[PDB]
Amino acid sequence: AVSKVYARSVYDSRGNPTVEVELTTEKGVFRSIVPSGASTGVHEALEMRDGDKSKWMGKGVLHAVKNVNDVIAPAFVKANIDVKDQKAVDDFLISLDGTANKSKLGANAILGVSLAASRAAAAEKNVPLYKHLADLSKSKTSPYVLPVPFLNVLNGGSHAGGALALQEFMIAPTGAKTFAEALRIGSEVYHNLKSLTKKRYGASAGNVGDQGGVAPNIQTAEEALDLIVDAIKAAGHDGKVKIGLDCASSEFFKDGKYDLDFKNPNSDKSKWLTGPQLADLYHSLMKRYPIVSIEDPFAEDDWEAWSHFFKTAGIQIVADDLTVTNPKRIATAIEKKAADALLLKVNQIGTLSESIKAAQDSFAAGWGVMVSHRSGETEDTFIADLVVGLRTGQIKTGAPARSERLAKLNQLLRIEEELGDNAVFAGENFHHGDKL
Amino acid sequence: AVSKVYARSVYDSRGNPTVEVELTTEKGVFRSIVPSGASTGVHEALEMRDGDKSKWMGKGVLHAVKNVNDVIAPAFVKANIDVKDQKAVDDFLISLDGTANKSKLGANAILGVSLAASRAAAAEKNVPLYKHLADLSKSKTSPYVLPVPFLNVLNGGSHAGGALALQEFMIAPTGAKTFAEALRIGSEVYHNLKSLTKKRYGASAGNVGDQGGVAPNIQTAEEALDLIVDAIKAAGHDGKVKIGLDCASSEFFKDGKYDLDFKNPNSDKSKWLTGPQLADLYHSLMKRYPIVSIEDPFAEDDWEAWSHFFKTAGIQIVADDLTVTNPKRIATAIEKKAADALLLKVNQIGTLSESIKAAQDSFAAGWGVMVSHRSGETEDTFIADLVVGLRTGQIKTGAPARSERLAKLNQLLRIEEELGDNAVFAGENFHHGDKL
Ligand SMILES: [Mg+2]
Ligand SMILES: [Mg+2]
Ligand SMILES: [Mg+2]
Ligand SMILES: [Mg+2]
């Protein structure tokens, strides 16, 4: 039984406040922390901020923490909920809020409770978190599936300097034999990329972006990609490392068109592209580089562009801001055949149950699922256990730098070690890892 | 009763492998992770690295991990040692090694066991880690003392781009009334610094260094300091935030001279300053800026230079590479009156006991003690509990960015909350928090 629910303000990887929740039962104290994105989709559940300019640059989460201690906490404890019944836990929270976008209490007030409950439940059942998460999602645990790590080693986009339009340039060691090998390979390629970057762009270009990757002032994606390929070869891993991209095109979508130089206040409007035009650029890159996944190639509501492209894509197309981990929007994407993979962010929807539902609906449509972190992370490692529990076979949780990223990668090392031969590495089968 | 000692490889904040140890008792499994420095003093205890340039860039810790599972673990379990008796735990580890620098098993093999044992001990005693650390060190606990955080918000030095010689430019919110307020104030100054840095040196200059601070291409300490002071003021905290520096001068000490532009090959040897000349520069910075602490102003063995400067320093002078948390070198420093504050790094010496002894000898000499992280950190939060347990009143664990730094700051927030009226904030008394 839950004897206490408590929330406090903690700081995320960018130094901004965020919500941390502790749930107390007879088994102890279970803590979960809520992450925060930067390029947040317009349809994401509401992240409640105080807006007090005289404090934390106006990014305090006092209202959210208060919503947990003064509203959720008393009602939750009184309800005497069974933490093992994740569905009941979340139906209560969703009803308590009473809004579709969780704007009354705030998604960042609700999620912490939702996640902490699952941890308390796992301890009650006397099983590790990933196992409990497999049960909740009715996932196969014989054997488990380890995910291929998609490491964002080179950063571009809105909050990542330069003129580079595309947000993320990830490497995926699909050729590795184990997760531990994939991670070692990833670290070697990353270190080789830092040395090459520092030499070609200056020592300063060695500093990292929010997610841990280098962020040199590069102009075109071609330049970045050619640089990544040199790193893979210099590191001696040619043939084992593939590439994944997160375009986050919603960030440069204006007047129904795409500005690939949006970080330039004097961008040439006659240079902005239409959906069909942008698609042609993607195809050109896809033919020159070992790209096996493309995320948010088009705007969060530009359905036509997604459908047109998917027609001749040929590779995994990941929906992030388009679907915002929302089953309702996912059903639409399926019907319109806009993509074949879901980027799963628990904080985009607000509860563990809704996230699991989103995953299940995706796997049912033959879609893949890549569990994801947010640009603003914490020392919390929930997604590591989640990606294993959901048996997706693919996760992106940062470059192999900055511990809000390494914390998840290390947890996967422990889970892998603990499972032994009771688990397999998704490798080249990352897309349909759930079907292994 | 310890039934198992185990070690594995995990990644630090720079993506380099490091040692993680778990100790199993009837109370459960306790994990501790070993940190790693970059500007390591020549006298530090040995950090055993594999040296296989084909794996992890040659930074593997397979040998150290093996020594834990193959040499340490077997004998430790058989000895049936009492985890509460920290001194007994460390005498065994030190004796098993046999070398004066822990070069047989490696300091990174011994430390993990030393720390994990203390966590297990606190569990057996059913008390918070900081409480058990206070007992081990015989420190006052009525009331507890929370530290002022020295946040390295602007980085330079060897492992940073640019030409800035000094390694760390820290801010310390001594004017705050609680640790929570100090952290908020620090986060605010940090963010104002970020925007200002990007506005002057370019958006790309917003990327962070290994310790989370901005690392723009700055030529002189004055330019860096003026920038920090502009941030403090823009944030509205003028007068409440002081400055601390880590020169790490051993990094640019050549031919008995100090090169303030050692990062440039064609550096004019004519500009190299002598011991007395470097001192004049420091006094100059001290009268111009609100600097309340200077670390490693002179080389790790340049004793006379330290003694001469200290005669008229007027502020806290911290020893890092000079003393390397070694009681024997601390004694020499005291006798020579070279400094009045010790930077305490548990991995510079190798065990918790020796670290505790170093702190005790320091306080007995009227010295201050600043607990410190390494440039290569992890999700481990041991030093948060250590600084509170030692009642020092001051710690440096990074800028308020990158979770290997925030993990510690967040842990201090939890400690402060738990203690309530039973703890006080060091504030302007940071130098002698132990006397509060
Ligand atoms: Mg986004
Ligand atoms: Mg995205
Ligand atoms: Mg150093
Ligand atoms: Mg130092």
Swiss-Prot record, chains A, B:
Keyword set, alphabetical order: Cytoplasm, Glycolysis, Isopeptide bond, Lyase, Magnesium, Metal-binding, Phosphoprotein, Ubl conjugation
Residues with PTM Phosphothreonine: 312, 323
Gene3D superfamilies xref list: Enolase-like C-terminal domain, Enolase-like, N-terminal domain
Residue(s) carrying Phosphoserine: 118, 137, 187
Binding site for substrate: 159, 168, 295, 320, 372-375, 396
Cofactor(s) in the UniProt record: Mg(2+)
Localization: Cytoplasm
Cross-linked sites for Glycyl lysine isopeptide (Lys-Gly) (interchain with G-Cter in ubiquitin): 59, 242, 357
Superkingdom in the source lineage: Eukaryota
Catalytic EC class: lyase
PANTHER family for the chain: ENOLASE (PTHR11902:SF1)
NCBIfam families: eno
Name of the protein: Enolase 1
